[PDB]
Amino acid sequence: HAHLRAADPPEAIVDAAGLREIRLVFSEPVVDRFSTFRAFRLSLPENGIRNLTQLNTLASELGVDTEESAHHEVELESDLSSQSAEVTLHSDEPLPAGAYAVVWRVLSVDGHTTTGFHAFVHAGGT
């Protein structure tokens, strides 16, 4: 099973003006053909959120079967062509400021499928 080991940006509030890519590192290599990744700019509730636990709750319902027209999907392209523990997902332009979730379903080289998510807050501009 491939679990997330590390991610940049991390699960934090970051500035990072000009951020345009997210890097994920898994605990084992994942297989390109059966691994998919999506990202969403999360809608915050009126009057905001106070901690990362609350951020995770927003992100925790998203998945690779999320309906794009029901959310604010960010189109990204992966660098995953073979099998790799590291995955880079890029946008064509800087990511706008916002709270974000990356969600995935990955097939490990060991043959097992896992899902997960990673969330962060981009409090810098373009």
Residues lying near a copy of itself in the complex (CB under 8 A): 9-16, 43-44, 47-52, 55, 96-99, 120-126
Report what 1 binds from Cu ion, a copy of itself, none; CB cut-off 5-8 Å by kind.
Cu ion
Give the nearest distance from C-beta 30 to a copy of itself in angstroms: 24
Q: Is 92 annotated as a binding residue?
A: no
**Chain centre to alpha carbon of residue 19:** 13
Distance CA 103, CA 93 (A): 20
Q: Is 1 annotated as a binding residue?
A: yes
CA separation, residue 124 to residues 15, 16, 74, 77 (Å): 4, 6, 17, 22
Q: Is 110 annotated as a binding residue?
A: yes
Report what 122 binds from a copy of itself, Cu ion, none; CB cut-off 5-8 Å by kind.
a copy of itself
Q: Residue 92 contacts by C-beta under 8 Å, 6 or more apart in sequence?
A: 20
Of the candidate spans 53-61, 84-92, 96-104, 106-114, the one that interacts with Cu ion by CB under 5 A turns out to be: 106-114
H or E stretch covering 59:
helix 52-59
Give burial (CB, 10 Å; 0-12/13-18/19+) of 19.
buried
Residue 3 binding Cu ion, by CB under 5 A: no
Residue 110 binding Cu ion, by CB under 5 A: yes
Report what 25 binds from a copy of itself, Cu ion, none; CB cut-off 5-8 Å by kind.
none
Site for Cu ion in 53-82 (CB under 5 A): none
